[PDB]
């Protein structure tokens, strides 16, 4: 058959926080969570594929 | 047959927070959750596919 | 047959928070939930597909 694959994976911000079996005392704690900021992102890409014919031809 | 695949995966902000079996005391805690901000994003991409014929032709 | 696939997955903000079997005391806690803000997003993309014929032709 013949495949053409063009794959763009750009911006990924992942954040995995876990606590298990915690028997603790917490007092006066700022900034314990999570923050994700993306500021003024411009995504100006071009993707072309000048391709021939596909499928089945008989003569 | 013949495939053409063009895939753009751009902006992904994932956030996974979990707590299991927590037997704890929490006092005066700011910023424990999660924040996701995207500010003024401009997505100005072009994707073309000048392609031939597809399917089945007989002569 | 012959496929053409053009896929744009752009902005994804996911947020998964879970608590299991929690036997705890919580006092005076701001910002425990979740926030998702998208500010002034402009999505100005172009996608073309100058393609040939599809299907079945006989001569």
mmCIF file of C-alpha atoms in Angstrom:
data_model
loop_
_atom_site.group_PDB
_atom_site.id
_atom_site.type_symbol
_atom_site.label_atom_id
_atom_site.label_comp_id
_atom_site.label_asym_id
_atom_site.label_seq_id
_atom_site.Cartn_x
_atom_site.Cartn_y
_atom_site.Cartn_z
ATOM 1 C CA UNK A 1 0.000 0.000 0.000
ATOM 2 C CA UNK A 2 2.529 2.596 1.243
ATOM 3 C CA UNK A 3 2.049 4.982 4.210
ATOM 4 C CA UNK A 4 3.084 8.592 4.695
ATOM 5 C CA UNK A 5 3.029 9.689 8.331
ATOM 6 C CA UNK A 6 3.752 13.213 9.447
ATOM 7 C CA UNK A 7 3.376 13.699 13.182
ATOM 8 C CA UNK A 8 3.860 16.870 15.205
ATOM 9 C CA UNK A 9 3.638 16.572 18.961
ATOM 10 C CA UNK A 10 4.501 19.993 20.298
ATOM 11 C CA UNK A 11 3.639 21.339 23.766
ATOM 12 C CA UNK A 12 2.974 18.862 26.580
ATOM 13 C CA UNK A 13 2.931 19.939 30.238
ATOM 14 C CA UNK A 14 2.206 16.982 32.487
ATOM 15 C CA UNK A 15 2.081 17.007 36.269
ATOM 16 C CA UNK A 16 1.514 13.913 38.398
ATOM 17 C CA UNK A 17 1.365 14.359 42.163
ATOM 18 C CA UNK A 18 0.390 11.524 44.515
ATOM 19 C CA UNK A 19 0.339 10.871 48.280
ATOM 20 C CA UNK A 20 -0.260 7.399 49.764
ATOM 21 C CA UNK A 21 -0.907 6.322 53.396
ATOM 22 C CA UNK A 22 -0.065 9.782 54.795
ATOM 23 C CA UNK A 23 -0.548 10.124 58.590
ATOM 24 C CA UNK A 24 0.938 13.604 59.016
ATOM 25 C CA UNK A 25 0.466 17.112 60.510
ATOM 26 C CA UNK A 26 0.615 20.095 58.109
ATOM 27 C CA UNK A 27 0.771 23.732 59.321
ATOM 28 C CA UNK A 28 1.071 27.074 57.439
ATOM 29 C CA UNK A 29 2.146 25.727 54.002
ATOM 30 C CA UNK A 30 1.879 28.005 50.883
ATOM 31 C CA UNK A 31 2.449 26.716 47.300
ATOM 32 C CA UNK A 32 1.710 22.971 47.715
ATOM 33 C CA UNK A 33 -0.362 22.386 44.534
ATOM 34 C CA UNK A 34 0.640 22.918 40.876
ATOM 35 C CA UNK A 35 0.729 25.697 38.243
ATOM 36 C CA UNK A 36 0.883 25.513 34.444
ATOM 37 C CA UNK A 37 1.146 28.729 32.496
ATOM 38 C CA UNK A 38 1.620 29.193 28.763
ATOM 39 C CA UNK A 39 2.007 32.840 27.808
ATOM 40 C CA UNK A 40 1.452 34.316 24.277
ATOM 41 C CA UNK A 41 2.233 31.068 22.256
ATOM 42 C CA UNK A 42 2.246 31.483 18.451
ATOM 43 C CA UNK A 43 2.112 28.311 16.361
ATOM 44 C CA UNK A 44 2.927 29.365 12.757
ATOM 45 C CA UNK A 45 3.956 26.046 11.144
ATOM 46 C CA UNK A 46 3.404 24.847 7.565
ATOM 47 C CA UNK A 47 3.035 21.206 6.535
ATOM 48 C CA UNK A 48 2.792 20.292 2.844
ATOM 49 C CA UNK A 49 2.575 16.952 1.009
ATOM 50 C CA UNK A 50 2.877 17.269 -2.776
ATOM 51 C CA UNK A 51 2.012 13.652 -3.453
ATOM 52 C CA UNK A 52 1.367 11.500 -6.542
ATOM 53 C CA UNK A 53 -1.650 9.249 -7.116
ATOM 54 C CA UNK A 54 -2.973 6.700 -4.612
ATOM 55 C CA UNK A 55 -5.046 3.565 -5.068
ATOM 56 C CA UNK A 56 -5.283 1.110 -7.937
ATOM 57 C CA UNK A 57 -4.702 1.781 -11.645
ATOM 58 C CA UNK A 58 -4.871 -0.717 -14.547
ATOM 59 C CA UNK A 59 -3.960 -0.213 -18.234
ATOM 60 C CA UNK B 1 -4.485 1.227 -0.822
ATOM 61 C CA UNK B 2 -1.977 3.814 0.482
ATOM 62 C CA UNK B 3 -2.483 6.139 3.493
ATOM 63 C CA UNK B 4 -1.473 9.746 4.052
ATOM 64 C CA UNK B 5 -1.548 10.770 7.709
ATOM 65 C CA UNK B 6 -0.852 14.276 8.896
ATOM 66 C CA UNK B 7 -1.244 14.686 12.639
ATOM 67 C CA UNK B 8 -0.788 17.821 14.724
ATOM 68 C CA UNK B 9 -1.022 17.448 18.473
ATOM 69 C CA UNK B 10 -0.186 20.848 19.880
ATOM 70 C CA UNK B 11 -1.069 22.120 23.371
ATOM 71 C CA UNK B 12 -1.729 19.584 26.134
ATOM 72 C CA UNK B 13 -1.792 20.590 29.812
ATOM 73 C CA UNK B 14 -2.506 17.583 32.000
ATOM 74 C CA UNK B 15 -2.645 17.534 35.781
ATOM 75 C CA UNK B 16 -3.201 14.395 37.846
ATOM 76 C CA UNK B 17 -3.366 14.767 41.619
ATOM 77 C CA UNK B 18 -4.331 11.881 43.912
ATOM 78 C CA UNK B 19 -4.392 11.154 47.662
ATOM 79 C CA UNK B 20 -4.975 7.648 49.076
ATOM 80 C CA UNK B 21 -5.628 6.497 52.684
ATOM 81 C CA UNK B 22 -4.813 9.935 54.154
ATOM 82 C CA UNK B 23 -5.313 10.199 57.953
ATOM 83 C CA UNK B 24 -3.849 13.680 58.452
ATOM 84 C CA UNK B 25 -4.350 17.154 60.013
ATOM 85 C CA UNK B 26 -4.211 20.185 57.671
ATOM 86 C CA UNK B 27 -4.083 23.799 58.955
ATOM 87 C CA UNK B 28 -3.797 27.178 57.140
ATOM 88 C CA UNK B 29 -2.700 25.905 53.682
ATOM 89 C CA UNK B 30 -2.970 28.242 50.606
ATOM 90 C CA UNK B 31 -2.380 27.028 47.000
ATOM 91 C CA UNK B 32 -3.096 23.271 47.339
ATOM 92 C CA UNK B 33 -5.152 22.734 44.139
ATOM 93 C CA UNK B 34 -4.141 23.345 40.498
ATOM 94 C CA UNK B 35 -4.059 26.175 37.919
ATOM 95 C CA UNK B 36 -3.891 26.067 34.118
ATOM 96 C CA UNK B 37 -3.640 29.322 32.234
ATOM 97 C CA UNK B 38 -3.156 29.862 28.513
ATOM 98 C CA UNK B 39 -2.789 33.528 27.631
ATOM 99 C CA UNK B 40 -3.340 35.070 24.126
ATOM 100 C CA UNK B 41 -2.531 31.867 22.045
ATOM 101 C CA UNK B 42 -2.507 32.357 18.250
ATOM 102 C CA UNK B 43 -2.614 29.226 16.097
ATOM 103 C CA UNK B 44 -1.792 30.355 12.519
ATOM 104 C CA UNK B 45 -0.736 27.074 10.845
ATOM 105 C CA UNK B 46 -1.267 25.942 7.241
ATOM 106 C CA UNK B 47 -1.609 22.320 6.138
ATOM 107 C CA UNK B 48 -1.832 21.477 2.429
ATOM 108 C CA UNK B 49 -2.021 18.172 0.529
ATOM 109 C CA UNK B 50 -1.708 18.565 -3.248
ATOM 110 C CA UNK B 51 -2.547 14.957 -4.000
ATOM 111 C CA UNK B 52 -3.168 12.862 -7.132
ATOM 112 C CA UNK B 53 -6.167 10.604 -7.762
ATOM 113 C CA UNK B 54 -7.484 7.998 -5.313
ATOM 114 C CA UNK B 55 -9.535 4.859 -5.838
ATOM 115 C CA UNK B 56 -9.746 2.459 -8.755
ATOM 116 C CA UNK B 57 -9.156 3.206 -12.448
ATOM 117 C CA UNK B 58 -9.298 0.765 -15.398
ATOM 118 C CA UNK B 59 -8.377 1.346 -19.071
ATOM 119 C CA UNK C 1 -8.982 2.441 -1.628
ATOM 120 C CA UNK C 2 -6.494 5.017 -0.264
ATOM 121 C CA UNK C 3 -7.024 7.279 2.790
ATOM 122 C CA UNK C 4 -6.039 10.880 3.423
ATOM 123 C CA UNK C 5 -6.134 11.831 7.099
ATOM 124 C CA UNK C 6 -5.463 15.318 8.358
ATOM 125 C CA UNK C 7 -5.871 15.652 12.107
ATOM 126 C CA UNK C 8 -5.442 18.747 14.255
ATOM 127 C CA UNK C 9 -5.687 18.299 17.995
ATOM 128 C CA UNK C 10 -4.876 21.676 19.472
ATOM 129 C CA UNK C 11 -5.780 22.874 22.983
ATOM 130 C CA UNK C 12 -6.435 20.281 25.693
ATOM 131 C CA UNK C 13 -6.518 21.213 29.390
ATOM 132 C CA UNK C 14 -7.224 18.160 31.515
ATOM 133 C CA UNK C 15 -7.375 18.036 35.294
ATOM 134 C CA UNK C 16 -7.921 14.854 37.295
ATOM 135 C CA UNK C 17 -8.104 15.150 41.074
ATOM 136 C CA UNK C 18 -9.060 12.215 43.306
ATOM 137 C CA UNK C 19 -9.131 11.414 47.042
ATOM 138 C CA UNK C 20 -9.699 7.878 48.384
ATOM 139 C CA UNK C 21 -10.359 6.653 51.966
ATOM 140 C CA UNK C 22 -9.569 10.065 53.506
ATOM 141 C CA UNK C 23 -10.085 10.251 57.307
ATOM 142 C CA UNK C 24 -8.644 13.730 57.880
ATOM 143 C CA UNK C 25 -9.171 17.171 59.508
ATOM 144 C CA UNK C 26 -9.040 20.247 57.227
ATOM 145 C CA UNK C 27 -8.939 23.836 58.581
ATOM 146 C CA UNK C 28 -8.666 27.252 56.834
ATOM 147 C CA UNK C 29 -7.548 26.054 53.356
ATOM 148 C CA UNK C 30 -7.821 28.449 50.325
ATOM 149 C CA UNK C 31 -7.210 27.309 46.698
ATOM 150 C CA UNK C 32 -7.904 23.542 46.962
ATOM 151 C CA UNK C 33 -9.946 23.057 43.743
ATOM 152 C CA UNK C 34 -8.924 23.744 40.119
ATOM 153 C CA UNK C 35 -8.849 26.625 37.596
ATOM 154 C CA UNK C 36 -8.666 26.593 33.794
ATOM 155 C CA UNK C 37 -8.427 29.885 31.976
ATOM 156 C CA UNK C 38 -7.933 30.501 28.268
ATOM 157 C CA UNK C 39 -7.584 34.186 27.459
ATOM 158 C CA UNK C 40 -8.130 35.793 23.984
ATOM 159 C CA UNK C 41 -7.294 32.637 21.843
ATOM 160 C CA UNK C 42 -7.258 33.201 18.059
ATOM 161 C CA UNK C 43 -7.339 30.112 15.844
ATOM 162 C CA UNK C 44 -6.510 31.316 12.292
ATOM 163 C CA UNK C 45 -5.429 28.076 10.558
ATOM 164 C CA UNK C 46 -5.939 27.010 6.930
ATOM 165 C CA UNK C 47 -6.256 23.409 5.756
ATOM 166 C CA UNK C 48 -6.460 22.639 2.030
ATOM 167 C CA UNK C 49 -6.622 19.370 0.065
ATOM 168 C CA UNK C 50 -6.297 19.839 -3.703
ATOM 169 C CA UNK C 51 -7.113 16.241 -4.528
ATOM 170 C CA UNK C 52 -7.709 14.205 -7.704
ATOM 171 C CA UNK C 53 -10.692 11.942 -8.389
ATOM 172 C CA UNK C 54 -12.003 9.281 -5.997
ATOM 173 C CA UNK C 55 -14.034 6.142 -6.592
ATOM 174 C CA UNK C 56 -14.220 3.799 -9.556
ATOM 175 C CA UNK C 57 -13.620 4.622 -13.231
ATOM 176 C CA UNK C 58 -13.737 2.238 -16.229
ATOM 177 C CA UNK C 59 -12.805 2.896 -19.887
#
